[PDB]
Amino acid sequence: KNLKEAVYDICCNGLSNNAAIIMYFTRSKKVAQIIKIMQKELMIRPNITVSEAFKMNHAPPKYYDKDEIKRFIQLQKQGPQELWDKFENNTTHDLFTRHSDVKTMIIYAATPIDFVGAVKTCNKYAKDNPKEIVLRVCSIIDGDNPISIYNPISKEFKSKFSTLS
Amino acid sequence: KNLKEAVYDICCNGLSNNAAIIMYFTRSKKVAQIIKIMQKELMIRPNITVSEAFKMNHAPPKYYDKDEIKRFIQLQKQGPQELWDKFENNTTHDLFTRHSDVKTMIIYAATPIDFVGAVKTCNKYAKDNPKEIVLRVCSIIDGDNPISIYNPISKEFKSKFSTLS
């Protein structure tokens, strides 16, 4: 239900050039082939961009103590400009990175029409494989089409969109 | 300055596990070298996940017909449920998938404290190379730490942060 509302909110303004789909895949026998067939099914439709499946690395965890959390808070109360400028963080860990099992795939769509139809397809794989797939939507603050050739398509879609209200 | 305010909004409520730093860069070998320096800086910090540099593919573009856009609007207006159930798209294209040469990287950070320090690190390399690297901040609806081991660290930070607000 949260996915339907989220996709609705993304489409509401007629623009989807700053949205994304993120999918995380656990390690599995079928996983890489799901990715292959999804990529293919997704891109029989125009305006869709799909990434390669990719890996990630991560550092060790760290818990911040109450005093550190508080001084971040005092710095927050000074607003965006002084949050950025006065932040400093010295914490080091003396260790290597861990290589994760989980694969990730990013999808984009140039217009709301493509976006709805892409999320519905992804949700279809996410439903049929519920143990191996996490599905989320992204709003990129001040984002645009990563593939710049789509820009006239989105701007034009928004144009016609706006005159219809 | 847009970046400062998006960072401030993502951290406003003591949750970064629903957030991401996204960066896009050109194929330049001189650029892949600066990315690696950046990853070295990033990984010496705790609570930071950094994906590999990854590539993307995409479909042909399509301009939607002012009349097709209308029928999508009639659905939008009936709401989040009806938009999802009723939407159909049977648009195809006669071409091949194209391979972009834009690379992409995604960075995660388990707490607002780690998120701010990672945007500040990533952003130095973006301003230093504004033609070859583009830097964004993302909000993932109902997101969690992609690496599960961080969940207790995020949940602790939030507990303390809500006590200290």
Q: What is the DSSP string of chain B?
A: -HHHHHHHHHHTTS--TTEEEEEEE-S-HHHHHHHHHHHHHHHTSTTEEEEPPB-EEE----PPPHHHHHHHHHHHTT-HHHHHHH-------SS--EE---EEEEEEESSHHHHHHHHHHHHHHHHTSTTTEEEEEEEETT---SSGGGHHHHHHHHHHHHHH-
DSSP string, B23-57: EEE-S-HHHHHHHHHHHHHHHTSTTEEEEPPB-EE
Run of H or E including A109: strand A103-109
Q: How far apart are CA A99 and CA B149, in angstroms?
A: 13
Q: Which amino acid is at A54?
A: F
> Which of A4, A113, A150 lies closest to B89 in CB terms?
A113
Q: Are B74 and A165 in contact (CB under 8 A)?
A: no
With vertex at residue B15, the alpha carbon angle to CA A7 and CA B17, rounded to the nearest 5 degrees, is 65
Domain A2-58+96-144: which CATH class? alpha beta
Chain A / chain B CB contacts < 8 angstroms: 261
Q: What 3-state DSSP class applies to A43?
A: helix
Give chain A positions within 8 Å (CB) of B56.
49-52, 106, 146-147
Q: What is the largest CA-CA distance in chain A?
A: 58
Residue A83 class from Cβ within 10 Å (0-12 exposed, 13-18 middle, 19+ buried)?
Answer: buried
Q: Which amino acid is at B16?
A: S
Residue A27 half-sphere exposure, CB side, CA atoms within 13 Å?
A: 4
Q: Which of A127, A136, A129 is nearest to A22 (CA)?
A: A136
Alpha carbon dihedral A26, A27, A28, A34, in 10-degree steps, equals: 60
Residues whose CB is less than 8 angstroms from the CB of residue A110 and which lie 6 or more positions away in sequence, other chains included: A16, A17, A47, A48, A145, A150, A153, A154, A157, B61
Residues 97-156 of A with CB under 8 A from B: 97, 100, 102, 104, 106, 110-114, 116-117, 120, 136-143, 146-147, 149-150, 152-153, 156
Q: What kind of experiment solved this structure?
A: X-ray
Q: How far apart are CA B73 and CA B10, in angstroms?
A: 31
Q: Of B2, B11, B62, which to mutate for an interface test with A (greatest number of A Cβ within 10 Å)?
A: B62
Q: How far apart are CA B2 and CA A119, in angstroms?
A: 28
Q: Which residue of A has its CA nearest to B61?
A: A47
Q: Do B4 and A48 touch (CB under 8 A)?
A: no
Residue ranges, comma separated, of all CATH 3.30.70.600 domains in chain B are 2-56+100-164
Does the beta carbon of B4 lie under 8 angstroms from any beta carbon of chain A?
Answer: yes
Q: How far apart are CA B35 and CA B39, in angstroms?
A: 6
Give chain A positions within 8 Å (CB) of B74.
none
Residues whose CB is less than 8 angstroms from the CB of residue B87 and which lie 6 or more positions away in sequence, other chains included: A116, A117, A120, B72, B75
Residues whose CB is less than 8 angstroms from the CB of residue B82 and which lie 6 or more positions away in sequence, other chains included: B75
> Which of B58, B63, B79 lies closest to A48 in CB terms?
B58
Q: Do B92 and A43 touch (CB under 8 A)?
A: no
Question: Beta partners for B22?
Answer: B106, B136
DSSP string, A60-102: ---PPPHHHHHHHHHHHTTHHHHHHHH--------SPPEEPS-
Q: How far apart are CA A24 and CA B110, in angstroms?
A: 17
Angstroms from A128 CA to nearest CA on chain B:
18
Q: Which of A113, A109, A163 is nearest to B71 (CA)?
A: A113
Instruction: Specify the DSSP class assigned to residue A16.
Output: -
Q: Which amino acid is at A63?
A: Y
Q: Which amino acid is at B76?
A: Q
Q: How far apart are CA A132 and CA A102, in angstroms?
A: 9
Pull the structure tokens for residue B154. Answer: 């995020």
Run of H or E including A151: helix A151-162
Q: Which residue of A has its CA nearest to B9?
A: A80
Resolution expressed in Å: 2.5
CB atoms within 10 A of CB A99: 10
Pull the structure tokens for residue A92. Answer: 């080091």
Pull the structure tokens for residue B79. Answer: 């709401």
Looking at CATH, the fold of the domain delimited by B2-56+100-164 is given as Alpha-Beta Plaits (3.30.70)
Q: Are B42 and A93 in contact (CB under 8 A)?
A: no
Q: Of B12, B25, B51, which to mutate for an interface test with A (greatest number of A Cβ within 10 Å)?
A: B51
